[PDB]
Amino acid sequence: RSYPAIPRIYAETTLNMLLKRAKKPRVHSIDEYLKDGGYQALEKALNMSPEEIIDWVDKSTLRGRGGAGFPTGKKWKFAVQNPGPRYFICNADESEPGTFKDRIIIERDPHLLIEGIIISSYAIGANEAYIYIRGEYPAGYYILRDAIEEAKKKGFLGKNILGSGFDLEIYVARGAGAYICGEETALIESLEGKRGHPRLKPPYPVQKGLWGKPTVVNNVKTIANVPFIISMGWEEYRYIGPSDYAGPKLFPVSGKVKKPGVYELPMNTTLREVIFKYAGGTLGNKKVKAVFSGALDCFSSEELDIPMDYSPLGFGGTGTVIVLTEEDDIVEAALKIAEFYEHETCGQCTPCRVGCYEQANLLEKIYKGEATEQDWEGFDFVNRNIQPTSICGLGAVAGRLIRQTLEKFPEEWEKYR
Amino acid sequence: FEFPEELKTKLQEHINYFPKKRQAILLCLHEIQNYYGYIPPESLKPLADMLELPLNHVEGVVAFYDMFDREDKAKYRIRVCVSIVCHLMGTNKLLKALENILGIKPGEVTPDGKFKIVPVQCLGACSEAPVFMVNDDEYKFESEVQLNEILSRYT
Ligand SMILES: Cc1cc2nc3c(=O)[nH]c(=O)nc-3n(C[C@H](O)[C@H](O)[C@H](O)COP(=O)(O)O)c2cc1C
Numbered sequence: 109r110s111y112p113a114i115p116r117i118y119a120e121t122t123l124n125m126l127l128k129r130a131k132k133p134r135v136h137s138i139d140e141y142l143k144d145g146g147y148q149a150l151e152k153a154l155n156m157s158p159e160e161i162i163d164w165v166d167k168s169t170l171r172g173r174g175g176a177g178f179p180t181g182k183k184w185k186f187a188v189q190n191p192g193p194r195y196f197i198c199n200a201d202e203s204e205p206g207t208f209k210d211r212i213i214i215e216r217d218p219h220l221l222i223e224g225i226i227i228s229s230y231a232i233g234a235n236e237a238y239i240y241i242r243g244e245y246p247a248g249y250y251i252l253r254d255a256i257e258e259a260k261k262k263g264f265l266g267k268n269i270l271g272s273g274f275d276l277e278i279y280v281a282r283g284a285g286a287y288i289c290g291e292e293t294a295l296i297e298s299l300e301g302k303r304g305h306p307r308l309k310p311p312y313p314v315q316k317g318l319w320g321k322p323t324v325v326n327n328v329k330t331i332a333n334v335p336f337i338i339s340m341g342w343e344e345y346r347y348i349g350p351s352d353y354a355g356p357k358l359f360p361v362s363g364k365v366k367k368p369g370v371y372e373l374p375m376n377t378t379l380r381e382v383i384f385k386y387a388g389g390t391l392g393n394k395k396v397k398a399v400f401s402g403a404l405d406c407f408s409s410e411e412l413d414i415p416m417d418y419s420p421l422g423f424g425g426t427g428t429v430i431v432l433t434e435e436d437d438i439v440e441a442a443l444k445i446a447e448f449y450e451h452e453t454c455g456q457c458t459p460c461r462v463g464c465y466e467q468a469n470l471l472e473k474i475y476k477g478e479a480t481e482q483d484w485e486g487f488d489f490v491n492r493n494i495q496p497t498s499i500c501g502l503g504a505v506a507g508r509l510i511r512q513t514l515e516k517f518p519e520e521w522e523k524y525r
Numbered sequence: 526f527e528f529p530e531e532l533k534t535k536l537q538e539h540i541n542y543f544p545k546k547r548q549a550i551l552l553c554l555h556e557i558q559n560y561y562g563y564i565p566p567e568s569l570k571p572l573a574d575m576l577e578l579p580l581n582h583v584e585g586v587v588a589f590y591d592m593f594d595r596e597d598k599a600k601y602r603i604r605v606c607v608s609i610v611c612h613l614m615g616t617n618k619l620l621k622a623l624e625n626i627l628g629i630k631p632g633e634v635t636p637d638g639k640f641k642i643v644p645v646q647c648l649g650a651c652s653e654a655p656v657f658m659v660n661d662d663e664y665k666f667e668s669e670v671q672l673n674e675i676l677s678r679y680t
């Protein structure tokens with residue numbers, strides 16, 4: 109079974125949960141999964157009522173791993189309060205710069221994800237589930253299709269799964285190059301065969317979603333926790349890591365570190381610990397200048413001792429850690445972030461459309477040294493006016509990292525003016 | 526304009542796969558580019574029909590998704606990431622090696638219509654930066670000698 113070639117992303121874990129198998133860079137098929145006790149949580153769950161599963165996932169304190177951190181149990185409860193049919197969607201668009209964690213669970217432990225989807229679908233009474241995977245992940249698509257066929261041959265999918273009365277089919281859909289299709293509402297739009305335009309909220313997907321029906325969209329990693337919760341029980345799971353943010357957390361570390369890769373760690377872990385204790389310190393032992401929290405935030409070297417949690421003075425985001433050392437031009441890097449937002453705005457909202465283009469256009473001029481004084485004052489203006497009238501989060505944050513970079517590295521910007 | 530039957534089969538298969546048939550528009554478009562080495566403009570009228578969809582809907586979809594190309598036919602698309610992480614780790618070294626080897630820059634096809642360099646945003650492999658794909662296969666760039674061996678696999 110040949111799949112397309114994949115770089116072997118390094119992976120390390122201290123909890124031995126989501127990365128139990130995925131820390132080795134190869135496809136774990138169903139036989140090997142069954143030997144580690146795979147699909148036994150499914151069997152367990154099918155002898156409990158859907159309600160009981162909702163309650164367990166709620167009591168676990170599992171929060172979403174796609175960014176918002178919304179309680180998964182509450183989201184499921186909201187959806188079941190609305191009459192069916194109901195749909196279950198696995199968000200695998202992972203297109204944010206610096207994020208490569210979801211792909212390793214998909215390419216290495218697909219049956220962990222499939223097992224979670226089946227349990228979760230049964231909890232919300234969904235008989236149709238979708239995995240929406242970005243189109244630049246062709247290998248993960250083909251691996252998922254083969255794994256679904258395996259689970260079906262073993263009686264984990266189809267009609268009347270293991271004599272339970274539950275029917276489930278999992279459809280695998282692909283993207284075609286659009287970061288915005290990771291926003292849950294634009295994903296549903298893409299799933300409907302349309303352009304990936306975010307819908308206005310409310311309504312939220314749990315009331316009106318796919319074909320207007322109650323729809324739960326969950327991230328790959330949120331779903332991958334569900335088998336563990338069923339297997340260990342809610343009380344045991346909730347004691348993992350910090351109380352405020354329980355469970356295994358996945359940190360994608362890239363840039364100027366010696367051991368770039370995915371790390372499974374508790375969230376009480378510090379930013380310095382991630383870089384130095386786990387990721388092998390900086391490359392060449394150069395001093396750290398800044399950490400880019402994906403394309404969302406910019407932390408300086410005077411903020412390395414912060415908990416990697418969702419707290420006041422926390423790191424937040426999706427815990428994405430891109431390291432920049434002393435020799436790296438952060439206005440050259442700021443331009444790179446600008447250019448991301450320029451290529452990814454869907455265009456619906458005027459300030460986002462125009463502001464994302466103009467931020468990148470002008471910063472290029474500033475970088476190349478051909479910006480007039482009016483180009484400078486306009487850059488500043490455009491940067492603080494991408495947000496207005498926007499109906500999704502991309503507009504809200506397109507100027508954010510860059511604004512922090514102006515506030516935290518003024519000396520480096522003055523060099524360009 | 527009609528598709529070869531070889532190709533119509535695959536498209537019917539995608540269209541039967543999902544519950545409603547219009548959900549298969551991206552898989553049909555992927556399959557057409559795969560087969561022709563681009564999306565021919567003349568291909569979109571018969572696709573729209575199989576999907577029971579108006580032409581201008583399909584036009585807006587092709588235009589929205591960045592993987593699809595209607596300008597240039599190319600056997601092997603070399604997708605080169607230009608986002609923050611790969612920039613830091615040597616996108617410019619990769620593009621230079623590509624220029625030395627293939628004689629082309631981003632957005633150009635080779636004169637034999639074999640390779641097109643396509644600048645793309647983050648490819649979700651940033652730990653192995655700088656990253657590039659050759660159609661579905663994906664790699665880290667280490668050096669020009671290494672790149673040259675990889676490209677020599679694609680005949
Ligand atoms: C522009 C944008 C991109 C997003 N990309 C992703 C993504 O790649 N994956 C993801 O799970 N959530 C992404 N989200 C968040 C989703 O809309 C949604 O909150 C999430 O899929 C819910 O699942 P969760 O409860 O498991 O976190 C994105 C949001 C925005 C505004």
Ligand code: SF4
Binds near residue numbers: 458498
């Ligand atoms: S804020 Fe930007 S990306 Fe979001 S819907 Fe509006 S135009 Fe599209």
Ligand code: FES
Binds near residue numbers: 612646647651
């Ligand atoms: S920045 Fe190039 S793959 Fe992520």
Ligand SMILES: [Cl-]
Binds near residue numbers: 176501
């Ligand atoms: Cl959101």
Ligand code: NA
Binds near residue numbers: 138139142
């Ligand atoms: Na077996």
Ligand code: NA
Binds near residue numbers: 254257
């Ligand atoms: Na399948």
Ligand code: NA
Binds near residue numbers: 201283286
């Ligand atoms: Na994308």
Ligand code: NA
Binds near residue numbers: 648649650
């Ligand atoms: Na990729």
Ligand code: NA
Binds near residue numbers: 667
């Ligand atoms: Na290497």
